[PDB]
């Protein structure tokens with residue numbers, strides 16, 4: 511593990527804040543003009559978190575195509591992810607329209623609806639089988655089919671129905687419920703088991719549209735999810751797995767959405783997740 515030597519070096523020297531700042535400095539900056547139009551102000555949860563115009567997901571509605579969502583395309587890994595913010599009360603319909611239009615099979619949620627006593631996300635899925643949700647603005651119906659509650663995460667089967675065409679699809683909702691209010695998990699074990707559960711479902715496979723990944727802003731925890739998945743996939747593909755540089759992969763992903771990995775602690779956690787996940791393969 512050359513990276514595990516890089517890990518001990520940065521850890522022993524306590525240089526995480528320093529590595530993190532060099533990533534911040536080197537990160538791409540692309541226009542986000544559509545996000546900043548006044549008519550889109552209530553479609554953004556945070557005024558400083560915007561999709562780049564070049565990678566933004568466009569809704570197929572003539573009126574206003576805008577959602578705070580980015581397509582991450584990792585060419586070498588053959589993996590694509592949509593990263594988005596936790597939906598707002600007024601964007602729950604747009605969220606499900608995007609899931610429908612992009613042919614996504616899975617939604618990965620890395621936050622609780624309430625954290626630190628404030629709402630981080632609208633309740634955008636049904637809590638009971640017999641109480642379905644209708645999104646009048648986008649003509650979609652959503653039903654809870656089943657719910658499997660485990661210690662660290664919940665998996666839900668949902669049926670999404672296009673009321674316009676009466677087509678239905680099954681969507682899997684993967685809800686990681688134990689990310690702490692402050693900092694990062696002590697151990698990456700439950701995060702890796704969650705990531706392997708998503709992979710096992712087929713939600714990340716090229717047969718389907720890209721997986722939708724969100725937390726509150728869609729950059730921090732969401733960033734760690736995609737970064738760990740892509741790094742482990744590249745390790746599997748590569749003739750020289752050690753050639754895998756987490757910092758380079760992160761900078762590539764930052765071409766597609768700003769601010770992925772919010773803290774030096776999330777960066778350290780990403781290294782730890784990848785190092786431990788590589789041990790799982792062996």
Ligand SMILES: Cc1nc(-c2ccc(C(=O)O)s2)cs1
Nearest residue numbers: 511512513745751752788791
């Ligand atoms: C067959 C596989 N090898 C690895 C790695 C071996 C050595 C590494 C390194 O030194 O970084 S990664 C992951 S899966």
